[PDB]
């Protein structure tokens, strides 16, 4: 019945910057939420507005919706590590017979990337605990304007830039993983379609 | 506070499944969604105690509420379509919600293609450890079907959550095959001291989510059950 259009689908901020999300309707929502659902956690409530044109702050979060009752959008200030999630817009359903139920949008899936301030981009190889035989190749300390593709190789896996444990940002840094069983693969050449820093540090097992 | 059960489960198609919820505020209103990667939609919702009315998609689910605290999601017939992740939900007064953790189910036509990770921890280089006088462990987990892992660090029996990095989402093995064993990766860089000490002991754990003991196996191979799958390595100092 009703639809909430929320956009966009993805947001990919860097760290200590702004965010900003549109939540656009058809029809009027008397009362417009907003939810932050952490990975591997639910959805939680963000903030409530039952006022139309009320614009409420609560510190970092910042969010309103017009008095056409159709629109809201909702702002993240310093964007911190714990900021990662889906976040959907949902407004109180009109009418009775719908009430207490709540249409919600499709979401904006956030990712917050480290701020790197001294890159020292290079590839190393790492050798398995049990058999030496095996190895992985480990991309790391690139800055976040290097961005990890994966490989024309059907037999070479490509890891792209893992999300950072919220607990403690010590040692925050990016990395790729990239690993194969075909004899012809050489970390030199496994991030071969990529583009990688100029100054990239390749040494040798 | 809102509890689901279970959080992860495995079942069949035809089988017959049900998603437990509980609250103890004793909340009115009541809500099951699934969230498929076109967001959060309604299954059935409860307005009070044997009140059930449908919801977005009812079609396959069965709900009831005879008690006010309990609102049980109940898969007749399931079907690979109902592969998703479950949220329920609750409301005292409208309209704030409060949703419980999450189930993640996931149906199959077969328990042939269930399979346990293989977990294996790769040792840092010692170039990295003589160019940013610091070591990176990489922990592999590879070959599991579905996805049901956690991964988690542990080095001498305390949990390592500074300079950890885990994958967002596993890595298909064969993205173009369907129903293909999964691959996760992950990382902990300690300073090159505190590797170069041989006591200190790394070891990485993937809980994997399986089959329960009220399965069988006619197959050969070890019936792969909910278990820890686990790589150990020690620091050396050269």
């Known amino acids: 019945m009703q639809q909430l259009n929320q956009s966009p689908q993805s947001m990919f901020i860097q760290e200590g910057e702004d965010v900003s999300m549109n939540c656009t309707s058809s029809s009027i929502f008397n009362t417009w939420l907003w939810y932050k659902q952490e990975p591997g956690e639910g959805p939680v409530l963000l903030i409530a507005?039952?006022?139309?044109?009320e614009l409420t702050s609560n510190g970092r979060l910042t969010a309103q919706f017009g008095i056409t009752r159709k629109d809201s959008f909702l702002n993240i200030s310093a964007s911190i590590p714990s900021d990662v999630g889906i976040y959907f817009c949902?407004?109180?359903?009109?009418?009775?017979?719908?009430?207490?139920?709540?249409?919600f949008g499709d979401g904006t899936t956030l990712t917050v990337k480290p701020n790197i301030q001294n890159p020292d981009p290079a590839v190393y190889q790492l050798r398995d605990s049990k058999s030496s035989d095996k190895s992985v190749c480990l991309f790391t300390d690139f800055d976040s304007q290097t961005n990890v593709s994966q490989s024309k190789d059907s037999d070479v896996y490509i890891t792209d830039k893992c999300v950072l444990d919220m607990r403690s940002m010590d040692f925050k840094s990016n990395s790729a993983v990239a690993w194969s069983n075909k004899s012809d693969f050489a970390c030199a050449n496994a991030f071969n379609n990529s583009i990688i820093p100029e100054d990239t540090f390749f040494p040798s097992p | 506070g809102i509890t689901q059960s279970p959080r992860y489960k495995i079942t069949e198609t035809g089988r017959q499944v049900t998603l437990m919820c509980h609250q103890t505020w004793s909340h009115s209103y009541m809500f099951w969604y699934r969230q498929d990667l076109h967001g959060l939609r309604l299954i059935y919702y409860?307005?009070?105690?044997?009140?059930?009315d449908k919801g977005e998609v009812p079609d396959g689910y069965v709900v009831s509420r005879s008690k006010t605290e309990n609102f049980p999601l109940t898969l007749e017939s399931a079907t690979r379509s109902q592969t998703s992740v479950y949220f329920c939900a609750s409301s005292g007064v409208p309209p704030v919600q409060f949703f419980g953790p999450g189930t993640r189910l996931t149906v199959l036509e077969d328990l042939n293609k269930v399979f346990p990770p293989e977990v294996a921890v790769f040792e840092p280089s010692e170039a990295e450890i003589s160019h940013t006088q610091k070591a990176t462990l990489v922990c592999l987990a590879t070959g599991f079907f579905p996805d049901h892992v956690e991964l988690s660090w542990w080095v001498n029996g305390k949990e390592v959550h500074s300079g950890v990095c885990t994958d967002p989402q596993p890595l298909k093995e064969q993205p173009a095959l369907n129903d293909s064993r999964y691959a996760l990766s992950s990382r902990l860089r300690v300073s090159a001291t505190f590797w170069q000490n041989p006591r200190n002991h790394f070891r990485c754990q993937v809980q994997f989510y399986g089959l329960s003991e009220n399965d069988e196996w006619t197959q050969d191979r070890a019936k792969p059950v909910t278990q820890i799958v686990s790589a150990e390595a020690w620091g050396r100092a050269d």
């Open positions: 409860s307005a009070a105690a044997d009140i059930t």
């Open positions: 507005l039952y006022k139309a044109g």
């Open positions: 949902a407004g109180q359903d009109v009418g009775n017979t719908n009430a207490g139920k709540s249409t």
